[PDB]
Design a protein around this motif. Structure first.
Motif, PDB file in Angstrom:
ATOM      1  N   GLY A  14       0.771  -1.219   0.000  1.00 20.48           N
ATOM      2  CA  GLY A  14       0.000   0.000   0.000  1.00 20.48           C
ATOM      3  C   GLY A  14       0.810   1.280   0.000  1.00 20.48           C
ATOM      4  O   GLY A  14       0.271   2.322   0.379  1.00 20.48           O
ATOM      5  N   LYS A  15       2.064   1.247  -0.450  1.00 20.24           N
ATOM      6  CA  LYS A  15       2.894   2.447  -0.474  1.00 20.24           C
ATOM      7  C   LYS A  15       2.285   3.534  -1.343  1.00 20.24           C
ATOM      8  O   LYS A  15       2.220   4.704  -0.936  1.00 20.24           O
ATOM      9  CB  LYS A  15       4.300   2.103  -0.965  1.00 20.24           C
ATOM     10  N   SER A  16       1.853   3.181  -2.557  1.00 17.90           N
ATOM     11  CA  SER A  16       1.240   4.183  -3.430  1.00 17.90           C
ATOM     12  C   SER A  16      -0.047   4.720  -2.823  1.00 17.90           C
ATOM     13  O   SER A  16      -0.292   5.937  -2.810  1.00 17.90           O
ATOM     14  CB  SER A  16       0.965   3.541  -4.787  1.00 17.90           C
ATOM     15  N   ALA A  17      -0.886   3.826  -2.294  1.00 18.66           N
ATOM     16  CA  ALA A  17      -2.143   4.258  -1.698  1.00 18.66           C
ATOM     17  C   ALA A  17      -1.927   5.244  -0.551  1.00 18.66           C
ATOM     18  O   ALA A  17      -2.649   6.251  -0.441  1.00 18.66           O
ATOM     19  CB  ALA A  17      -2.896   3.019  -1.221  1.00 18.66           C
ATOM     20  N   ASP A  53       8.798  10.289  -2.011  1.00 21.55           N
ATOM     21  CA  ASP A  53       9.246   9.297  -2.976  1.00 21.55           C
ATOM     22  C   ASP A  53       8.906   7.910  -2.478  1.00 21.55           C
ATOM     23  O   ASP A  53       8.823   7.674  -1.271  1.00 21.55           O
ATOM     24  CB  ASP A  53      10.754   9.421  -3.180  1.00 21.55           C
ATOM     25  N   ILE A  54       8.679   7.005  -3.415  1.00 19.55           N
ATOM     26  CA  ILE A  54       8.397   5.613  -3.112  1.00 19.55           C
ATOM     27  C   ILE A  54       9.537   4.754  -3.642  1.00 19.55           C
ATOM     28  O   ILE A  54       9.907   4.849  -4.821  1.00 19.55           O
ATOM     29  CB  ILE A  54       7.059   5.160  -3.709  1.00 19.55           C
ATOM     30  N   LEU A  55      10.074   3.904  -2.773  1.00 22.66           N
ATOM     31  CA  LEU A  55      11.113   2.950  -3.132  1.00 22.66           C
ATOM     32  C   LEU A  55      10.509   1.556  -3.163  1.00 22.66           C
ATOM     33  O   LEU A  55      10.099   1.024  -2.133  1.00 22.66           O
ATOM     34  CB  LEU A  55      12.221   3.020  -2.100  1.00 22.66           C
TER      35      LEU A  55
ATOM     36  N   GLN B  60       2.623  12.884  -9.657  1.00 19.07           N
ATOM     37  CA  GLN B  60       3.204  12.566  -8.358  1.00 19.07           C
ATOM     38  C   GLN B  60       4.657  13.007  -8.247  1.00 19.07           C
ATOM     39  O   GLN B  60       5.151  13.256  -7.138  1.00 19.07           O
ATOM     40  CB  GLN B  60       3.123  11.063  -8.136  1.00 19.07           C
ATOM     41  N   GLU B  61       5.360  13.052  -9.373  1.00 19.52           N
ATOM     42  CA  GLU B  61       6.772  13.364  -9.395  1.00 19.52           C
ATOM     43  C   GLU B  61       7.026  14.837  -9.260  1.00 19.52           C
ATOM     44  O   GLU B  61       8.184  15.215  -9.049  1.00 19.52           O
ATOM     45  CB  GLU B  61       7.412  12.752 -10.615  1.00 19.52           C
TER      46      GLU B  61
END
Ligand SMILES: Nc1nc2c(ncn2[C@@H]2O[C@H](COP(=O)(O)OP(=O)(O)O)[C@@H](O)[C@H]2O)c(=O)[nH]1
Ligand SMILES: Nc1nc2c(ncn2[C@@H]2O[C@H](COP(=O)(O)OP(=O)(O)O)[C@@H](O)[C@H]2O)c(=O)[nH]1
Lengths: 168, 168
Positions: A14-17, A53-55, B60-61
């Motif tokens: 659920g990182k994006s959510a 940011d999402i990794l 998002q970026e």
């Protein structure tokens, strides 16, 4: 001098959510006549302008060259597992160890997040996760993007952890 | 030893579609008993193992901290516009200039890509794009992920550009 937040964890936790929901409730338009179109969107959390940011390490990101670059740039990390995914919880320690190695630091701002806490099919108990967070010295919070439980508090807590680190 | 490819361009030009289609046709499983589960997926293009990343600056970026990090890490860049999106073509020069600035280099491997060449609603002519590419000294190719035209050739050409740069 934005605060640089990185959301890390296994695929599908659920990182994006989480990140989308945070942006939805905290973005603002700012006037800035030094940029082309004179307005830019920013996210403000607990009084601080934040970058997000999402990794991700699986899927398309198995082919990425950028993992360590995300870890070096990020100032604090939301370490996310899902409460219905034991493997995702088991994967947390590897992420945390890699971050500490790449940043060459024993003091990295982090919050442990147990997402999907609306789900009835729990396999990671709150106590297991609290024990892990206590070993690391970091906060733990359960979240759900479905009910909104905890989501704001997870990111605000991370901002306070970064702030305390920067005031050292 | 891996070649680090970065796909750049405006939102919606087809960066993800191009990258996914490349992976679909070029991924392989490799045996590697040093890594945890003994097998890893890799992409091989023109004999080279490649890493793949997408640099998006909008959506998002707009909140990301990582733009310059992608530019520093990437070894060659696919600069993508869409043939039915004049603004996306106008935006190419800014991307190229930023890459050159961040990398502090006049010799950066790049290929100009005009994607969506299946569409009948063209507003960027092949000659306009070829003129741009000639000014930069780089190859130009039109692609479509719908018909598969050009997609492999765009990435293979970029690999050759990187190879020639590394042999200098
Ligand atoms: N029940 C439930 N599903 C969630 C929650 N957060 C995300 N999801 C779902 O979990 C899946 C993976 O979410 P995503 O944000 O794509 O995960 P990522 O791969 O970590 O970015 C999607 O189907 C989401 O709808 C949550 O709090 N509760
Ligand atoms: N007609 C056509 N549509 C395409 C092509 N490549 C991508 N698209 C579509 O263009 C949209 C944007 O593509 P996407 O890969 O998300 O773009 P990105 O934002 O640059 O990653 C999507 O609806 C794709 O289906 C192409 O070659 N032809």
């Amino acid at each position: 001098t934005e605060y640089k937040l990185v959301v890390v964890g296994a695929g599908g936790v659920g990182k994006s959510a989480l990140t989308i929901q945070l942006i939805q409730n905290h973005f603002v338009d700012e006037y800035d006549p030094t940029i082309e179109d004179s307005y830019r969107k920013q996210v403000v959390i607990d009084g601080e302008t934040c970058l997000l940011d999402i990794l991700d390490t699986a899927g398309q990101e198995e082919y990425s060259a950028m993992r360590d670059q995300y870890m070096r740039t990020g100032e604090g990390f939301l370490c996310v597992f899902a409460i219905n995914n034991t493997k995702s919880f088991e994967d947390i320690h590897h992420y945390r160890e890699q971050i500490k190695r790449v940043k060459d630091s024993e003091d990295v701002p982090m919050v442990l997040v147990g997402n999907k806490c609306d789900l009835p099919s729990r396999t990671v108990d709150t106590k297991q996760a609290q024990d892990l967070a206590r070993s690391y010295g970091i906060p733990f919070i359960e979240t759900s993007t479905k009910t909104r439980q905890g989501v704001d508090d997870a990111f605000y807590t991370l901002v306070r952890e970064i702030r305390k680190h920067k005031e050292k």
